[PDB]
Amino acid sequence: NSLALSLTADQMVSALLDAEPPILYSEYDTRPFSEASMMGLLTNLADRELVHMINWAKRVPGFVDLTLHDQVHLLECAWLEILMIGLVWRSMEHPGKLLFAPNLLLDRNQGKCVEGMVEIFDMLLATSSRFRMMNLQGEEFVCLKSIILLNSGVYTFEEKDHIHRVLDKITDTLIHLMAKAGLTLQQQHQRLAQLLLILSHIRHMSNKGMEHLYSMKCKNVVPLSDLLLEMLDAHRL
């Protein structure tokens, strides 16, 4: 039996809020960027964020109950989605801008030096704007991020039943938050649907991103770390 299912909605929210990873900074060094320096900064940053993501993942209710193998699979499936929804969340209050770090705030123009970056930048910006116009709350955000972790790899596997039961718990929690915020019953399931459909778009961005990461590995110009190489290999094989 997993203690995640015995938690109340408030206990779930507080647990997720407390598990939140820190906001990291980029290297504090000269403009404009080149393709090499741009990808350098983003890669270094994502790599450091990954270490904190694992800590966060272990604190998401239900995740500790999985085998090591299943924990590995889920993170391998979801890590870029999780980085992206974090990026999009951070950027909400900065329309037209992507806040990769407090000292690394980029617009679509700075993407042109890297092939396909403008395209994904636009997708990320569209997502941020959507969250902003929806007035997404941090409590809702941490629920969505946990859903991505638990859902994205679940159909590439009693343990699937566990994940689904925890996913149900997180749904209960989202609805509880919206009811708490004063939304009508109709507004609650409309909003729930709206948020979960955005996840399909996040999946789409991660897949596009994973393609570019593979080609960046092949180009052999921008050094990926061993951790990222292992994350990347997991998706192409």
Partner: peptide, 12 residues
């Protein structure tokens, strides 16, 4: 073997 293994097992 896998860095992800080490990171999950030493998680905090």
């Amino acid at each position: 073997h896998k860095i992800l293994h080490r990171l999950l097992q030493d998680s905090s």
